[PDB]
Amino acid sequence: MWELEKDVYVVEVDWTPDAPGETVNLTCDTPEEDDITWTSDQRHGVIGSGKTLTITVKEFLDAGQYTCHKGGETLSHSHLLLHKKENGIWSTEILKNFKNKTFLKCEAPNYSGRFTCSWLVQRNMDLKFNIKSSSSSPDSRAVTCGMASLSAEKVTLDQRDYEKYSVSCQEDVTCPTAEETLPIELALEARQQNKYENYSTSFFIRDIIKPDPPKNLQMKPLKNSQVEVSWEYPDSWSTPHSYFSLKFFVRIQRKGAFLVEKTSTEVQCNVCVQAQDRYYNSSCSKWACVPCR
């Protein structure tokens, strides 16, 4: 057993059919010692007595809020969370894994340090999330995450849909030109009723880069059918643009798209264009399209 927060405890449990439950002692935080009574928010009536209650916790009915009582007045109360372990494996039932069997998908528009992570949920009901820096050493990269939000978009995998969640985070210390020598190691804590699970990931910001679409994609004709198309870097992108250079791909929407490093080209013809980091093969941006007219 281990403490998640004040008077909230997590109990690791083996979920095999004939598993021996964990015996856990829960003492009351009070000076009195007589007439002490215990109750549960799952079971009806008195389920124990004495300042310290000793119980065998295997099923979820053994979880919930345990309250002390003496002489009709309430005292302290402790909460028990369950962490399932089946076949030696920690349960992964709150989250729905992506096609690649991973759970967390993060993406960043620039090297500033800001990024967002998102996840899927199997059933959006009675959920509680909490994200933080896994490693807490001095030579670790400190991260300050925001609050998790339910997304309007519903992902469709197999032939089934799933609600998506998302959270924004910012990296504490940065020196933009420098190379990242160790990754950002994250850990997601998930609660659902009295079930506890947690998911971890490590990554470098460079691998999660996804620029924003190019702005002001304008047109100007020249001669019969030939036309020059121009645009400009997005406002979100890192500066200076001489350092965070970009390579753009140009396709024609009625793969086979051709790369152009300048911010304009002439071609005969929808005209769609996406962006990518010039020097690193990171994720490309969303397409910015305009009619070939």
Added chain:
Amino acid sequence: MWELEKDVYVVEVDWTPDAPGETVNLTCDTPEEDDITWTSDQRHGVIGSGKTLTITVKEFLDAGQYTCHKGGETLSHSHLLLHKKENGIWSTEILKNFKNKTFLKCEAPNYSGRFTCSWLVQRNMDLKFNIKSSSSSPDSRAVTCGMASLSAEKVTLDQRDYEKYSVSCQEDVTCPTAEETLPIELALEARQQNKYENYSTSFFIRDIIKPDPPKNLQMKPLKNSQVEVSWEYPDSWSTPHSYFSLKFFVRIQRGCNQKGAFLVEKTSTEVQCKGGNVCVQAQDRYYNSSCSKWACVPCRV
């Protein structure tokens, strides 16, 4: 009065004609209390007695090394330095100021944190220097300076020459990309015989930048008299070169000397000279800091 180092004290003195000198008590660092006598390395014979010597210090003869004695044997000794103050202003007589009336001139070849400061001296005799971080707060910029060295070069100002000194320094904490939020505050301690003075300066490394000359300035002709000249960034310059960009100036030889040079951001150009020298200097693309020394080659093919 205040202690500079073990048994070396500094005495601030008002140098007006009729100023009352500061009376300072000097006790001996010894357990004995009898038969105690004092001497000076300036005055002849015994100049005092008693465990504690009380004197009025106004002129420089009142300075120097004061030694204790008992029965012909030497005891401890303390050294006194004077800081002159005239019309409320602290004296600046050991160093010779540059044309711009400043005393310290520093220059750095890159944003690494390394840089050097130099000064002139009025009389190169019996000198002792020491440079350090003036502010000693947590949010100050810590700097580790070296030892002052006599330079071979002798500057000539007006119609008179002066010996030059220089010292190299490195900033404790650095992050090439980092923004400068507070300046480097330095302080030079200068000693000359029994005279004490000190000079202070504040600056951002960006303002003292002076790049090294561009390397490998090659030529290759093309057409009549026309020829393309190419080069590359100096090895000393900060990396990556994509971030620490430069602006180059190109002149034709028959801080920044900006009279008939034309700017070129690329590392090569084509130009007509048909003989002579082609000189080129460098500068930071984004900041108007000091330019580098010229790199010249003959316009020959």
